[PDB]
Nucleic acid binder design. Structure first.
Lengths: 126, 732, 171
RNA sequence: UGUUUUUUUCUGUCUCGUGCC
């Protein structure tokens, strides 16, 4: 029954806080910077390294202010939290591609209304 | 059915997998590809010269495509068309070169088709920085440039767009030419405009808009890849230097840890020396590796001047700055990284080649069949007394007395040993009783440490002093290293021959077999079995597929040179299953022939047994004519095939000066007299034989005359080495 | 998908750890206990960012061990069905494709892949191309996919991808 | 130029009578 396509999740996960690829990337980078210092400490594990090299290959923007602006210009809408991560991470070109990938956008908003948002997201990319 | 009842042999089909045969026009292309890709970095096949080597490779490829020839079948049967004994890796190298040429041709054809389709799509779209379908022809023509061709094709796909519905700085071609020639023939955009004006005509308000496009164009340009290719791969003084943690973790075990400050290692040390490449790969795996040419700091400076404007007064200065920025962006995108990747790939290839060469050398050294038969040739063979003891410390040591016909006659144990702290007679009495129990022909003792060597020496001394070798003579117990017999004792053959026996008996049997017929043991093992023996530590770093292929080729060549006994693999299990590494007789074909022989009960009547009984096809018989041998026609158990039977008979008659009347069996003076020993060699002239072969036969017999004479004079010639007695260092 | 939620956990502290570094020891124990693990309720956890507070240690009767029900603010990665992400191809095989969704590895079969992407066993690098050879997909490429299934192999998530929906490849 | 050993908590039934603080 758990299918994110139809916007359904358990009660505990419904009250979660979404994270973007750049956000998690910078969080892990800061954690690594803090951990590497303060000698006599247990070093990072393979999980941290794989997550780092996985999120580093999808960092659409390095500036934190870019993350702040792209979340601010998005939260003003009426979309759910789930629509804040996938759409901000994939960064599709045209509205048709976004509507095809995410079935929730089908009929939820107009065409130009989503195309302008996609163009803004593309421009915000570094 | 297709492997055993196929028109072409199994080896020929397996060799030309990507390229199903060679056409008349494609033979020249395959030969050219093989010659070009025969020895680029190291010197290999420089023997055969350049043009002569290319011609020989082309002839071998043509023979393989037409007559379904194979590696040994073309190296021996086509000694004239290929290098006449230039090197061992003649047929296999030719097959590999032909396969590479065919693959390159197929890739070039696919690239040309893709380029034509893209050009047609572009013409249809824009015909109703442009997009022209002119690079497709270049990509299709670039057959030799594999990596460069792929890079150029990928760059073109990323530049034109790759979409399939159903003025900024110097041009890319001009920049590539100026970089390749070393002189900047074309400068940047010599216009009054600067990045301020160019960053407003996209919608970014940043001066780095055109830099990204310039970098993408430079990276995705075949000319840039060609110019950078070979510049650092040809020479790269890789400086080996351990890091902070690699210095202690390596402990001077790898290439990047043995020399604390031993840097400046050129490509010769990594490519030619496979050990250095293996060490660098191992060190670069976990801890770290020191692989840096350190030669760019000066190769990247010269490119900076090219593609940039020379004047500086706004327009000229702005153009020069923009060109420099674009060049830097392109270098950072695919300039240093591409060169480093190419150098790493070249180093890995060199290490793999070195590992394969070491494995092939080890296989050639250890595969030569050099048994120790009676008199170093009563009864056929000698009775090898395989003595494979466990400890020699009051424990039962296996001691089997196998016969010389690939079978074990008997065995026994010797629990008594010098057990007892002070007992110098029990071991002697046990050895005397064991020697008197049977009548072996030779002693094959093993060794593990000083105690084992002392026990072997004591046993040999007791046998020689009391004449325990045969009961009526002293027999020298030949030392045998416990290397092959230990592995063969616990193999499938050892288990099948004896199931309810201790490991000592199996080890003794394996040792006895290894010192009687190494070829039989090598052919009767899985090749799994060959992979158990390590050829060198550097082979582990390189791909094991190349080593396995080299070992299989060496085994096939050895089998072809020594031949196969048809009767030996009919009833004797020890000398059975030896039709897997024959020239043209693959494993499936050999298994089918063995099954047919076991069912119908057909014996090796002559060379045409598989052509008359309907067991093997014409191509299979022709390709495997020089490898199948029988016990009894006269020229069946030799390299003389049916085609050269008449020529061999005529040559023997002329040398013996006997009558000529349909000699196949009936005249024996020319056959039996010449087979017993050399009757007359001056009677048979090389020029006359060659002229006769050319006039009648459709082939020159200048190179095959010697082989035919040897086959007529000596049948079933063995290509294995002699019996190698253990030495001091070798014994240890 | 990565998320930031508030979790709770308790760890017994042996009395030998009492002293001026009690809180530091509790934090150190917490760090090396709830990092990298996985559970079927909240999913796979990456690491811990910060800790909210330290509960009151209730010493057990007749035992020196004391438990601290700490509530930490850590992140979690719990992919669901139907989500679309961008991963990288790790290996190409005739049986199927292998990718790496961060701390998880999925797998797509040839049946899911359309018939246009054929095999290239002749070429040394395993790759899939079309008849015209225009589009090329190989390893170390940012290729998207769709999570059509989930699985947890005893705290080891291993989902399954798919390649039927359009616009799934090179961006 | 040598020196012989390694296995271990078992476990018993239901009923009646007598004596003692």
């Amino acid at each position: 029954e758990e299918d994110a396509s139809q916007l359904i999740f358990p009660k505990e996960f419904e009250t979660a806080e979404t994270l973007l690829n750049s956000e998690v990337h910078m969080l892990l980078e800061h954690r690594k910077q803090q951990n590497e210092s303060a000698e006599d400490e247990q070093e990072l594990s393979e999980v941290f390294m794989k997550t780092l090299n996985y999120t580093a290959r999808f960092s659409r923007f390095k500036n934190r202010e870019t993350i702040a602006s792209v979340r601010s210009l998005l939260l003003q809408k009426k979309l759910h939290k789930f629509e804040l991560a996938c759409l901000a991470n994939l960064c599709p070109e045209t509205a048709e591609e976004s509507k095809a990938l995410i079935p929730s956008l089908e009929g939820r908003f107009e065409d130009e209304e989503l195309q302008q948002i996609l163009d803004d997201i593309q421009t915000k990319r570094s | 059915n297709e492997i055993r009842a196929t028109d072409l042999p199994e080896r020929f089909q397996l060799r030309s997998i990507p390229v199903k045969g060679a056409e008349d026009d494609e033979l020249e292309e395959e030969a050219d590809w093989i010659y070009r890709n025969a020895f680029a970095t190291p010197t290999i096949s420089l023997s055969r010269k350049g043009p002569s080597t290319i011609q020989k490779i082309k002839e071998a490829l043509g023979f393989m495509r037409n007559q379904h020839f194979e590696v040994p079948f073309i190296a021996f049967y086509r000694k004239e068309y290929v290098e006449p004994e230039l090197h061992i890796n003649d047929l296999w190298r030719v097959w590999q070169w032909d396969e590479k040429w065919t693959q390159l041709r197929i890739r070039k054809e696919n690239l040309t088709r893709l380029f034509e389709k893209m050009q047609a799509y572009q013409y249809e779209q824009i015909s109703a920085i442009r997009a022209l379908d002119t690079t497709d022809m270049e990509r299709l023509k670039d057959v030799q440039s594999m990596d460069e061709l792929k890079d150029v094709y990928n760059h073109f796909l990323l530049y034109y767009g790759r979409d399939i519905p159903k003025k900024f700085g110097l041009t890319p071609e001009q920049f590539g030419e100026n970089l390749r020639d070393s002189y900047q023939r074309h400068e940047t955009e010599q216009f009054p405009a600067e990045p301020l004006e160019l960053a407003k005509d996209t919608p970014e308000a940043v001066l780095e808009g055109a830099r990204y496009m310039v970098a993408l164009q430079i990276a995705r340009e075949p000319l840039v890849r060609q110019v950078l290719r070979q510049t650092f791969q040809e020479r790269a003084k890789l400086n080996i230097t351990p890091t902070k943690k690699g210095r202690k973790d390596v402990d001077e075990a790898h290439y990047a840890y043995s020399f604390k400050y031993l840097k400046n290692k050129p490509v010769k040390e990594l490519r030619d020396d496979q050990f250095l490449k293996i060490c660098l790969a191992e060190d670069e795996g976990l801890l770290t590796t020191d692989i840096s040419i350190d030669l760019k700091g000066t190769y990247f400076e010269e490119i900076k001047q090219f593609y940039y404007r020379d004047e500086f007064s706004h327009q000229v200065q702005e153009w020069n700055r923009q060109r420099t920025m674009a060049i830097e962006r392109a270098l950072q995108q695919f300039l240093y990284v591409q060169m480093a990747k190419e150098l790493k790939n070249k180093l890995l290839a060199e290490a793999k080649e070195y590992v394969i060469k070491a494995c092939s050398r080890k296989l050639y050294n250890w595969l030569r069949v050099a048994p120790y038969r009676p008199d170093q040739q009563q009864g056929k063979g000698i009775r090898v007394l395989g003595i494979a003891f466990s400890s020699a410390r009051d424990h039962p040591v296996f001691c089997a007395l196998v016969n010389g016909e690939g079978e074990v006659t008997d065995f026994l144990r010797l629990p008594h040993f010098t057990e007892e702290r002070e007992k110098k007679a029990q071991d002697i009495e046990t050895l005397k009783k064991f020697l008197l129990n049977k009548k072996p022909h030779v002693v094959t003792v093993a060794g593990e440490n000083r105690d084992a060597q002392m026990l072997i020496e004591d046993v040999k001394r007791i046998v020689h002093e009391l004449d325990q070798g045969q009961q009526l003579s002293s027999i020298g117990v030949e030392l045998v290293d416990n290397e092959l017999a230990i592995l063969y004792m616990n193999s499938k053959k050892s288990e099948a021959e004896f199931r309810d026996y201790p490991p000592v008996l199996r080890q003794a049997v394996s040792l006895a077999r290894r010192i009687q017929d190494p070829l039989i043991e090598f052919a009767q093992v899985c090749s799994e079995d060959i992979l158990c023996l390590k050829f060198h530590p550097l082979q582990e770093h390189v791909v094991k597929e190349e080593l396995l292929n080299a070992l299989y080729c060496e085994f096939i060549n050895r089998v072809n040179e020594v031949g196969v006994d048809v009767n030996r693999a009919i009833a004797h299990p020890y000398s059975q299953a030896l039709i897997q590494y024959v020239c043209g007789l693959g494993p499936r074909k050999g298994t089918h022939l063995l099954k047919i022989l076991k069912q119908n009960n057909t014996r090796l009547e002559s060379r045409t047994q598989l052509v008359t009984m309907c067991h093997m096809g014409p191509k299979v018989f022709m390709n495997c004519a020089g490898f199948l041998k029988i016990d009894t026609e006269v020229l069946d158990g030799s390299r003389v095939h049916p085609e050269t039977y008449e020529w061999a008979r005529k040559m023997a008659v002329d040398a013996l000066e006997y009558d000529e009347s349909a000699e196949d069996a009936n005249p024996a003076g020319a056959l039996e007299e010449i087979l017993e020993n050399p009757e007359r060699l001056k009677d048979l002239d090389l020029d006359a034989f060659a002229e006769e072969l050319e006039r009648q036969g459709y082939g020159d017999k200048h190179i095959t005359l010697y082989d035919i004479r040897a086959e007529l004079s000596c049948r079933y010639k063995d290509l294995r080495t002699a019996y190698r007695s253990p030495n001091t260092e070798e014994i240890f | 998908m990565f998320y930031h939620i508030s979790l709770e956990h308790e760890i017994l502290l042996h009395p030998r750890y009492f002293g001026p570094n009690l809180l530091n020891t509790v934090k150190q124990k917490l760090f090396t206990e709830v990092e990298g693990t996985c559970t079927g309720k909240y999913g796979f956890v990456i690491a811990v960012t910060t800790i909210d507070n330290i509960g009151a240690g209730v010493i057990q009767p007749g035992r020196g061990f004391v438990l601290y029900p700490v509530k930490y603010k850590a992140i979690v990665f719990r992919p669901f069905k139907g989500e679309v992400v961008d991963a990288v191809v790790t290996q190409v095989n005739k049986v199927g494709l292998f990718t790496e969704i961060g701390p998880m590895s999925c797998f797509i079969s040839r049946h899911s892949i359309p018939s246009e992407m054929e095999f290239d066993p002749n070429s040394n690098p395993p790759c899939y191309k079309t008849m015209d050879e225009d589009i090329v997909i190989q390893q170390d490429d940012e290729i998207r996919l769709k999570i059509v299934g989930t699985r947890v192999d005893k705290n080891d998530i291993f989902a399954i991808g798919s390649l039927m929906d359009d616009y799934l490849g090179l961006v």
